[PDB]
Structure 1
Amino acid sequence: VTQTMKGLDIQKVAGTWYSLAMAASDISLLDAQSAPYRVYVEELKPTPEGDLEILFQKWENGECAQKKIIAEKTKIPAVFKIDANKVLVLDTDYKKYLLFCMENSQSLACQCLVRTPEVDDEALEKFDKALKALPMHIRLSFNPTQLEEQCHI
């Protein structure tokens, strides 16, 4: 991944987000409700030290689980680390959309986050543009009804 947000101000990503689209290098990373990278972002909670707490939903064992993880800052404002993985922030306008990618050490999943439960065509175009450079083999997007449901069911 060679696209990062220049000048990212992590404090201004605080608050509510919706996983409007997802994409991944391998079909099995997103194909089932219980696939490893099928994660629905709910809320971003930046810390004063500049770590990113993430609230998300994940389907585990026929149930939509509410989950929490800390992404630790690095020397690069647009790149965080997660234990189990790099999180890279590609692009955001803070008020409407955020594009990000997660990568292990060849598995890659990226999302288009939006602030409201609405299909934002401009944000999906930028998402689409950013993926043109990436070896993606699965793409999902969700309608506004799914965006307001637990695990987008």
Structure 2
Amino acid sequence: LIVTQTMKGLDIQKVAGTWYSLAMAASDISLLDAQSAPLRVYVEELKPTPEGDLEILLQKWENDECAQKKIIAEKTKIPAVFKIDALNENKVLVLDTDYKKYLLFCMENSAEPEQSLVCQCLVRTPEVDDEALEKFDKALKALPMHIRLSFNPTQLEEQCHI
């Protein structure tokens, strides 16, 4: 409840498939800082289960290898908000998406709002879509982001973006 953009009428069945983390932004430099930074994760695929949940397939630099992890986000009463389990009460929010080109989403710990916000711009193809980045930035001006990363085509095709 910091993110004032929520998508009306989300059909998670339609966000299924292949995705590229084109841009990232966080409210804290230390969350996206290095490759081994805690929330520096790359989305590979979004898989919605028939129950209504959302299996997230991402990549992250855990050790000194591009490890593949599988997170599952359970649906809540609100169709655009999902829950990820732990000691950390993290919510996932879908801000906007046309299903065919991009998807904007943020993640925040319910307890530490300002200290856990991380948002990304996901695109279908490994191209630099300017229109998507505009919408991403627009949704971002209202939030306290302090670091913004952007990736190029070549990097998008590499595991963990090199």
Quickly name the TM-score band, shorter chain normalised: over 0.9
The Cα of 1:111 is off from its aligned counterpart by: 0.2
Could you list the per-position Cα deviations for residues 1-52 of structure 1 after superposition, in whole angstroms to 9, with x for gaps in the alignment? Answer: 1101100001000000000000000000001001111010000000111100
3-state SS, counterpart of residue 67 of structure 2? strand
3-state SS, counterpart of residue 128 of structure 1? helix
Return 15-24 or 97-106, whichever deviates more.
Answer: 97-106
Could you list the per-position Cα deviations for residues 62-94 of structure 1 after superposition, in whole angstroms to 9, with x for gaps in the alignment? Answer: 110011011000000000000230000000000
Tell me, in whole angstroms, the C-alpha distance in 2 between the residues paired with 1:45 and 1:64: 20
Percent identity of equivalent pairs: 97
TM-score normalised to structure 1 length: 0.99
3-state SS, counterpart of residue 79 of structure 2? coil
The Cα of 1:107 is off from its aligned counterpart by: 1.1
1:87 aligns with 92
The Cα of 1:141 is off from its aligned counterpart by: 0.4
Tell me, in whole angstroms, the C-alpha distance in 2 between the residues paired with 1:36 and 1:82: 15
Between the two proteins, the alignment pairs up a number of residues equal to 153
Tell me, in whole angstroms, the C-alpha distance in 1 between the residues paired with 2:39 and 2:7: 22
* Aligned-CA RMSD value: 0.6
3-state SS, counterpart of residue 55 of structure 1? strand
Tell me, in whole angstroms, the C-alpha distance in 2 between the residues paired with 1:62 and 1:49: 35
The alignment status of 1:108 with 2:110, answered yes or no, reads no
3-state SS, counterpart of residue 8 of structure 2? coil
Gaps of 5+ in 1: none
Gaps of 5+ in 2: none
Tell me, in whole angstroms, the C-alpha distance in 2 between the residues paired with 1:107 and 1:45: 24
Tell me, in whole angstroms, the C-alpha distance in 2 between the residues paired with 1:107 and 1:68: 20
3-state SS, counterpart of residue 95 of structure 1? coil
3-state SS, counterpart of residue 60 of structure 2? strand
TM-score normalised to structure 2 length: 0.93
Could you list the per-position Cα deviations for residues 120-150 of structure 1 after superposition, in whole angstroms to 9, with x for gaps in the alignment? Answer: 0000000000000100000000000000000
Tell me, in whole angstroms, the C-alpha distance in 2 between the residues paired with 1:12 and 1:61: 34
The Cα of 1:60 is off from its aligned counterpart by: 1.0
Q: How does 1:1-150 map to 2 (within 5 A)?
A: 1-84=3-86, 85-105=90-110, 106-150=115-159
Tell me, in whole angstroms, the C-alpha distance in 1 between the residues paired with 2:38 and 2:48: 24
